Amino acid sequence: TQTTSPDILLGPLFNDVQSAKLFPDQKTFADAVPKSDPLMILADYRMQHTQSSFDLRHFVEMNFTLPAEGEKYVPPAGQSLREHIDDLWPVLTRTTDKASNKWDSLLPLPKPYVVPGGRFREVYYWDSYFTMLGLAESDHWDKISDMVDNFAYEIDTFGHIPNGNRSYYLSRSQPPFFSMMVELLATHDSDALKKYRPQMEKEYAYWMDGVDALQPGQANKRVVKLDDGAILNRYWDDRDTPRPESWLDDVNTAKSNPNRPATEIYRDLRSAAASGWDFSSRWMDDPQKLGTIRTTSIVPVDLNALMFKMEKLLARASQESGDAASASKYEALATARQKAIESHLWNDKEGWYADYDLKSKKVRNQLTAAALFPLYVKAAAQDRADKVAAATSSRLLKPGGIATTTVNSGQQWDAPNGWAPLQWVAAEGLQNYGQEKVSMDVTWRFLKNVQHTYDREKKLVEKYDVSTTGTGGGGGEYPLQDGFGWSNGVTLKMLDRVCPKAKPCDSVPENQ
Numbered sequence: 001t002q003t004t005s006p007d008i009l010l011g012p013l014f015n016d017v018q019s020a021k022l023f024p025d026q027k028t029f030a031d032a033v034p035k036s037d038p039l040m041i042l043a044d045y046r047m048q049h050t051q052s053s054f055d056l057r058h059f060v061e062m063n064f065t066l067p068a069e070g071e072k073y074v075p076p077a078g079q080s081l082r083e084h085i086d087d088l089w090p091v092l093t094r095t096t097d098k099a100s101n102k103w104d105s106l107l108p109l110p111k112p113y114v115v116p117g118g119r120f121r122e123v124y125y126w127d128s129y130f131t132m133l134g135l136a137e138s139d140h141w142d143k144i145s146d147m148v149d150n151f152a153y154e155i156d157t158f159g160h161i162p163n164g165n166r167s168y169y170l171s172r173s174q175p176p177f178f179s180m181m182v183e184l185l186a187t188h189d190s191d192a193l194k195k196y197r198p199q200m201e202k203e204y205a206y207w208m209d210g211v212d213a214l215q216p217g218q219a220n221k222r223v224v225k226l227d228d229g230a231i232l233n234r235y236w237d238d239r240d241t242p243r244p245e246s247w248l249d250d251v252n253t254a255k256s257n258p259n260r261p262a263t264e265i266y267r268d269l270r271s272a273a274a275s276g277w278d279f280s281s282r283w284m285d286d287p288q289k290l291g292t293i294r295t296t297s298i299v300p301v302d303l304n305a306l307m308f309k310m311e312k313l314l315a316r317a318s319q320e321s322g323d324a325a326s327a328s329k330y331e332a333l334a335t336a337r338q339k340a341i342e343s344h345l346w347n348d349k350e351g352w353y354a355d356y357d358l359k360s361k362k363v364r365n366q367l368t369a370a371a372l373f374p375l376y377v378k379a380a381a382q383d384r385a386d387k388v389a390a391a392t393s394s395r396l397l398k399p400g401g402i403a404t405t406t407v408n409s410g411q412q413w414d415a416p417n418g419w420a421p422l423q424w425v426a427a428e429g430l431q432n433y434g435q436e437k438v439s440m441d442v443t444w445r446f447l448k449n450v451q452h453t454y455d456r457e458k459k460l461v462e463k464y465d466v467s468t469t470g471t472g473g474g475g476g477e478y479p480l481q482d483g484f485g486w487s488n489g490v491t492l493k494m495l496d497r498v499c500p501k502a503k504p505c506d507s508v509p510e511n512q
């Protein structure tokens, strides 16, 4: 298991390859596997670099195994949407079985896993929950059990679930869905919550690391204590360097705001990656300037909704294990979390849940799809859930699904993009509070987007443009990717919902 990230292993050669844009994707060289000791490669590089007619591209090809060019998968013709999804899971399944070089950035895992697709050649944390939803729908429980085993292994090995199983992802996590993954598995293997309680508790300790030493108004890593003593979590990456997989992007973003310390920009870029919303006006002081991103001074409402669910599931796992003391402890933590959400992440002037600003010490005004998360995890009061439903129908519901924000910044977690996980969180949260009409509106409009895109493009994609139906989304630092893990998973769950359980549909119906 290579723990040293490529930027450190390969020093100036890494900076050279990335700054030269040898490859159109910065992630490509981050995933390049050295054919020999980096000490040798750097020595050979230092000596061969001076030679006239030295070709950096040839040196890289000589000394590195590069990621597969992605010679496109071709399915049999004529498959329906459901057929296409059902038969695509093997295409997205990968293992670390390959003869593992000591310096491979891909971290070994015990079991096979499902990747999102395209350039995403590793297992991702929050993607996998929504992928598991689709695997469960289509009766692939061994694949689900295997991925839960992988995530438990990562918790035991690294202390937390990394963004993905890459050395350059070890410094951060992602939206914490592991407890909800175990809950999903428990619907099939009734002992799963008891079985994985130790890793669930270890992950909780990672998020809460240092909470006991905090005074009001202080923060440590992923946890904050507000001026009134309320305890909440934030996204946080342990490093303050450029992301190796986006090296040149982050260097240039830092150079675009030279009056700000680059380490602070890098920390907030990395922590936005930890949020899953890389990137969004949600984190930015100026939605047109990524150099104004300030993720670590924002208390995210979605993260703290997920922390509430984790505390509730830890109490359930403890209660099922016959551990009354732990069950009581975690129930009390969940109760305090719910109060902290209602007291600090509710915008009463606007009538929706929102992030909390650590600088101004106030709930923020911006409406994003994260406002649905307290409904999703059943922390919201009914009257506030009703107001969020009204804000959703009136501001976020678009022809092709629920919008991510109302700000078209050019970043990908923003208008006009709709993301499968947010469609599911919205539909479920609305359903949890009896808002069945808006819930079905989100479901139907996103399914129509997925079906029309599949009819026209013969694929599912990473995100969708919700201003119409039939087109994938865009924005941000890399092109729209195909596959695609959570799009496929959410689509299966929603497709089952719009046709009778006894006569399922394989395409989204024409009407309703």
Ligand SMILES: OCC1=C[C@H](N[C@H]2C[C@H](CO)[C@@H](O)[C@H](O)[C@H]2O)[C@H](O)[C@@H](O)[C@@H]1O
Pocket (backbone or CB within 6 Å): 116, 120, 124, 125, 126, 127, 163, 243, 245, 246, 273, 274, 276, 277, 278, 279, 477, 478
């Ligand atoms: O589908 C995988 C992911 C890719 C996207 N982010 C990845 C790509 C970024 C490089 O372009 C990487 O820095 C980030 O950590 C990764 O999680 C997306 O925004 C995430 O929500 C998602 O989990």
